[PDB]
């Protein structure tokens, strides 16, 4: 809510999927053409926005933790998820998605499955 970030301004505006990656204490958008590609060394924040019959928007916030992501990344993804939720007035359900234990719902967002990628952006520490 007091948060002033260009990505928070874009989050949950229209129905669809939005993916951001944690890059050294910042929340950086992932190119829409790369959605589904996940660096096992990084952490990401995923927002699924759905339009309800009554006009409201329904949110599902998934923070995905790659097997080799550093503490600052997994830590940041969690906090960003709580901040995004708060910013969206808390109409979102938060889901922690660990590489290899992803929810069927989260997997359901990707028609061609997930593409794991070794590596990622360096820790912010």
Partner 1 sequence: EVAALVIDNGSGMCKAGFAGDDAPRAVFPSIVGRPRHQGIMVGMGQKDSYVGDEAQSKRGILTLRYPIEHGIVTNWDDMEKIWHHTFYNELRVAPEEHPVLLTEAPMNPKSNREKMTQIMFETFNVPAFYVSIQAVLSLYSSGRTTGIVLDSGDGNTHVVPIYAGFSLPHAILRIDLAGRDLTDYLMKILSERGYSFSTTAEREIVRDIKEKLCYVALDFEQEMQTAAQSSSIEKSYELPDGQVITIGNERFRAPEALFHPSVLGLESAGIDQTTYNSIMKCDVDVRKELYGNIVMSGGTTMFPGIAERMQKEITALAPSSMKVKIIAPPERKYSVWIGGSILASLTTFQQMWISKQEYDESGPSIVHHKCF
Binding residues: 41-42, 73, 85, 90, 92, 111-118, 121
> In this structure, are residues 124 and 91 in contact, taking their beta carbons and an 8 Å threshold?
no
Number of residues that bind partner 1 (CB under 8 A): 30
Q: How many beta carbons lie within 10 A of that of residue 19, not counting itself?
A: 21
Q: Which is nearer to partner 1, 79 or 113 (CB)?
A: 79
Q: Maximum CA pair distance of the chain?
A: 45
CB of 78 to partner 1, least distance (A): 5
Positions 41 through 80 that interact with Ca ion (CB under 5 A): 41-42
Distance (Å, rounded) from C-alpha 8 to C-alpha 71? 23
* The one among 5, 110, 114, 117 contacting partner 1 by CB under 8 A: 5
* The one among 11, 27, 46, 47 contacting partner 1 by CB under 8 A: 27
Nearest Cα residue to 20 out of 50, 98, 1, 39: 39
Distance (Å, rounded) from C-alpha 124 to C-alpha 62? 21
Q: Which does 17 bind (CB under 5 to 8 A by kind): Ca ion, partner 1, none?
A: none
Positions 71 through 90 that interact with partner 1 (CB under 8 A): 71-72, 74-83, 85-86
């Amino acid at each position: 809510m007091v948060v002033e970030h260009p990505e928070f301004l874009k989050a949950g505006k229209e129905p669809g999927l939005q993916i951001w990656r944690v890059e050294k204490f910042d929340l950086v958008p992932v190119p829409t053409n790369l959605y589904g590609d996940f660096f096992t060394g990084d952490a990401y924040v995923i927002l699924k926005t759905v339009q309800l019959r009554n006009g409201n928007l329904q949110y599902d916030l998934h923070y995905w933790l790659g097997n080799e992501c550093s503490q600052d990344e997994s830590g940041a993804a969690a906090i960003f998820t709580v901040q995004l939720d708060d910013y969206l007035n808390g109409r979102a359900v938060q889901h922690r998605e660990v590489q290899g234990f992803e929810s069927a719902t989260f997997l359901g967002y990707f028609k061609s499955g997930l593409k794991y990628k070794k590596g990622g952006v360096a820790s912010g520490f």
